[PDB]
Write a protein that binds this DNA or RNA. Sequence first.
RNA 1: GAUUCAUAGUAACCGAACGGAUCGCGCUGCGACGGAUCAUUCAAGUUUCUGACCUAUCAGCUUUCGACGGUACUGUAAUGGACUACCGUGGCAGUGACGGGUAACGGGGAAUUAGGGUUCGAUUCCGGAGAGGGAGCCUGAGAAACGGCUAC
RNA 2: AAACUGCGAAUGGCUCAUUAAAACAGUUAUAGUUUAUUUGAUGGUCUACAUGGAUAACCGUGGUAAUUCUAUGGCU
Lengths: 259, 220, 128
Amino acid sequence: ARGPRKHLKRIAAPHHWMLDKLTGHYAPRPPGPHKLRESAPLVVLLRNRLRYALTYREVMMIVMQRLIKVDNKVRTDQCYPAGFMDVISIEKTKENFRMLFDTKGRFVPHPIREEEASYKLCRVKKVVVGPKGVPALITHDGRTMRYPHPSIKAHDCIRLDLNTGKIVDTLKFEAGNMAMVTGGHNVGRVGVIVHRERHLGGFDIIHLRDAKNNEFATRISNVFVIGKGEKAWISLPKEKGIRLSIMENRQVLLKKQQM
Amino acid sequence: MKLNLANPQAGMQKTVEVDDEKKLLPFFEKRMGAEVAGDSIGDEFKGYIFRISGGNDKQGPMMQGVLVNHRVRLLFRKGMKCYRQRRTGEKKRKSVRGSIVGPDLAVLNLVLVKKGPETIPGLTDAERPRRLGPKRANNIRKLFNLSKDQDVRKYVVRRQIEGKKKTKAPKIQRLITKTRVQRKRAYLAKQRRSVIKSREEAKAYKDVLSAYKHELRKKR
Amino acid sequence: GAFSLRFRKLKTNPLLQRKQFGVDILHPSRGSVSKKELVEKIAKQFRVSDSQSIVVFGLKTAFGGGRSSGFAMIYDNPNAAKKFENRFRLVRLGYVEAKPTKGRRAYKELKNRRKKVRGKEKAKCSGA
RNA sequence: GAUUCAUAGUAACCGAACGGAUCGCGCUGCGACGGAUCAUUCAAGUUUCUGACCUAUCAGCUUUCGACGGUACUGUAAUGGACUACCGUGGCAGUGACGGGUAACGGGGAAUUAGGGUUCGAUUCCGGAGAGGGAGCCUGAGAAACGGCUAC
RNA sequence: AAACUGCGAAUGGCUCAUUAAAACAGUUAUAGUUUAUUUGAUGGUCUACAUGGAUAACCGUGGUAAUUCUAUGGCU
């Protein structure tokens, strides 16, 4: 009541962080570009994915060196919400991490090449006219690129340059274009787009087809266009967003563990 | 009863006890900020005149403008007298003496305007000098009268401390200098640069959208 | 009785100027291993300069005895190790002497008295 | 999906708001702080539909002092009988209104060995309400706050 | 050190007395609105080598039986 809540609790955290039940009563709380449940804070990358830090203390000792950057910019706050399709860049080690969705429905820092780690994609939420009658995009990231093409519509991605501010490569939202899912049940799945239903009132949905010919649906808010009909602007994680079945995921896992 | 006599200009003061009733009788039914004659307070006090500033009564404050001859309870805002705030926005109710003077209060505080011929042993004899000279720049200028072109710096006030060799000095705020004038030039450069960038972005875009919609006329 | 060393989960960490790894150790006959004896052996394995760079913690012997496993953390320089590591871990090793602070209840009783006096408050320090 | 939306243009209005009298490292770079509008994020306030234990030895409730609706103010962060003027006579109820009881905060859940059920949920999380009883209010982005204030 | 300014103190913690289409639950809407902070934008158009005078702490000094009570005087 009475104002914004400064604590978040463990358990009442998101499940896709995979913070454990014991070993803490509270969990780190991420406001930044991204939402609370559609992001992951910079602490649980460093300690609970990348395994650089042990403790919450040690993440302060890393981040206040000014070694961590995101989007070619130094972020000093340890609880910064670093979300979908943000680049992370550490100068020592000289390795870069683009955050994608894993096929199971988790965040994972996908390691990438140095030339690839310049650019990143931003799907545009809407397009809107600012003052002096100038046009302007706005993104899922909460950037606002201005003077686009007239070409560029809602619900489609743009390759940003990052080294400079400006856009470079557009993409369109149509049938036969590659598209990852960012939320809901089918998260972490990439497939070409077959068809979308309108439903003139609320909630457009899209059916789309995995590269092993599995068909599945999501709302348009969740869908995020990568690239053209086959091929893709970005590098993909392990499995490339197929999501193999429950008995298959059993068989591959226990076949691994026997060595 | 116990008159606290203040010299403003010297910076000296000392309390005195009042024998008898009749020496207090000029002061009764008088406001704060009233120039009362201080001939009849005692023997040595001759040809004086005293403004009356405040006081406290047995209870132990009076504030000007309240009026009345007795203690009262008031709700205090921020920026009143006789109240330090603990919290921001805190008002509080608090007992306070009237401004008009009576017998039953303990202390009157008095401030002299014009001293007479005679000397007081407490007040008149000495002069305590002022501790801090002026920090900011045009306050130093108005002290000694410099115009502007005389320049500050050398007209600083520096006492030196006892024992070890050391001076201490105010650091003059609002002083014109190499860092301060450059910060305008750095700021005003960005205001110049940010306009002409955004203007050329608009001029570049104007031909691009015309180049787009001309290629759309080919489709017709 | 001696022991056999064999590290695991190694992670070279140049941001923190240190190397982190779980140790695993095998000691038939012997009851446990002291950290003063373990830090000497892990020094000569890893070809280190100075014991003071290395710091070691954890170490549970498993049920039955013979086996044990723990954590370890080779810095480079002892001066970098003194900065990034918290002081309690260094102290067990003995590199740095313990800091004798006053009690938590005693410190709290100063500041509540310090609330009451405005002006110059520093007479309360000697008074408590 | 849809406007009196965004935005541009025209004619004037007011001062009651922005257009940096600020600070550090080093013709020239970096970032600390301030503040306006527009998104964004953490939110919050209202809001649509559907859902609950016992009781008929509770059958008729609501209204001139807002009950249901209409027009035009006012008020609010905005929508509204939220409030004020006039105007109409409505609204709910036998599918349980209105009133009473609860040893009643709600839910996620818990116990209970076919299936169907019955009883519990003050209590780890998410809402809600409260700081002896009621009421009022300042400051602030946010409180009708109580380890803030005023009164009985 | 002290004091002024800024920010926080509206989170957290505790309890279950209220409360029966109320609250709450899932499900909408905000074209019916406010939003510190974060993130990204924007913007020359109204003595400009720099405007004004008071306030603490501090110093001098009191009141009251008594408190996180505080007055008068002098500086910045």
